[PDB]
Write a protein that binds this ligand. Sequence first.
Ligand SMILES: Nc1nc2c(ncn2[C@H]2C[C@H](O)[C@@H](COP(=O)(O)NP(=O)(O)OP(=O)(O)O)O2)c(=O)[nH]1
Ligand SMILES: [Mn+2]
Ligand SMILES: [Mn+2]
Length: 430
Amino acid sequence: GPHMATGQDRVVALVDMDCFFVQVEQRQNPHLRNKPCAVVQYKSWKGGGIIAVSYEARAFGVTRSMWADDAKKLCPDLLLAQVRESRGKANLTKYREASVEVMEIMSRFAVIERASIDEAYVDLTSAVQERLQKLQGQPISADLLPSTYIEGLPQGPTVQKEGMRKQGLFQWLDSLQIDNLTSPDLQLTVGAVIVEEMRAAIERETGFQCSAGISHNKVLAKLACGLNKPNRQTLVSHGSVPQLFSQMPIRKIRSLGGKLGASVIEILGIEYMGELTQFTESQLQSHFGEKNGSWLYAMCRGIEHDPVKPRQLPKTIGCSKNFPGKTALATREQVQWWLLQLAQELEERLTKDRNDNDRVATQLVVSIRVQGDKRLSSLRRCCALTRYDAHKMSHDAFTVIKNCNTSGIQTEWSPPLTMLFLCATKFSAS
DNA sequence: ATTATGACGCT
DNA sequence: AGCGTCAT
Ligand SMILES: Nc1nc2c(ncn2[C@H]2C[C@H](O)[C@@H](COP(=O)(O)NP(=O)(O)OP(=O)(O)O)O2)c(=O)[nH]1
Ligand SMILES: [Mn+2]
Ligand SMILES: [Mn+2]
């Protein structure tokens, strides 16, 4: 009862850019704005593979992973922007630089955890305590939450999307106890006011729109963020969780989309996240291991303790390229040439990283995939990264992988390589 | 020929 | 250290 801690200590937000690479290209090229648009990598094979899709194009059924030729079948007026190519491969530098723009704005409001190229978590607990101090018990006006949805509201006792949003927000605000600076619902509401400000700052200073989730932990904030995309933010309160999870497919929760979520569904004979509540912590640990079991036991009650890590920069810097089918590398000259191309891109990114961020990588991880292997990596080998020199890095990568060539002939490579991947890791402050 | 990465758990 | 999982 009273000692039953409900994981409402923290205010956590997740901010995720809407169709991010598309917005980067639309900012650069106004002709693409407010159009069905997608971003593609490469062109020759089936028109290139789509990795980002404007919401106008999603209305026609265009999705990531679709070949552009097929997307064009669904949406003949679809506009396409191609990722830059450098040294024979896709080069994502434009999107990484845009990402840095956004992350630097978010960092003004709180310490962030960079979780991908286009999203970050924010622990707003302290900023909320400050804004509550300033408010002096003053209520929160709906005018301060102009793009906020309250998940699960309105309820009970209407035809337009914005009208529904405002109805739900009024029900939420009317029920708020603003004299209690420790009410979790009030704390989430103040967090949402701050996130409105953060999102306004991002759009004003970059031209990019984003969505956001506000809840008591990272998993709920991420899920909330997705609920009302694009260009809106969603507050998922602790109290909204039973209804939200009652019909929430297990796979929708981050980390349960793969084999583990399939095993939850199959072993327990359930479909929805809320059904997990009927099992004891020990039962879940017995099926899914001690860590997963404890995580599931708390998560189906809306509780998760994973902290917002103070980390604005990526932990690794890596370069990869596939060589599918008849393009797989089957000679020693080919392997050396592409290792050098990857290594030159890596050198460039690493030198820029060192100048910006006062750190140096110390370990180089070489990953390859060999033909006829379905796994992502067929083999991973690490070596020391002592100089930011592409020729040295590619020579060392070759040295650590060259024992994989089963060809007796010196010139040929067998079986051919369908993937090369260089990753710089283990950063030290320089 | 669902590509380019990046985080993280496991042993 | 090297592999597997989840991601998108
Ligand atoms: N190279 C590469 N980039 C990718 C891939 N998948 C995504 N990206 C890039 C392109 C994406 O723009 C970006 C961010 O990924 P999201 O947040 O998952 N999708 P978005 O922001 O587009 O739309 P939404 O409004 O639904 O959040 O990552 C991929 O498989 N490969
Ligand atoms: Mn996004
Ligand atoms: Mn994202």
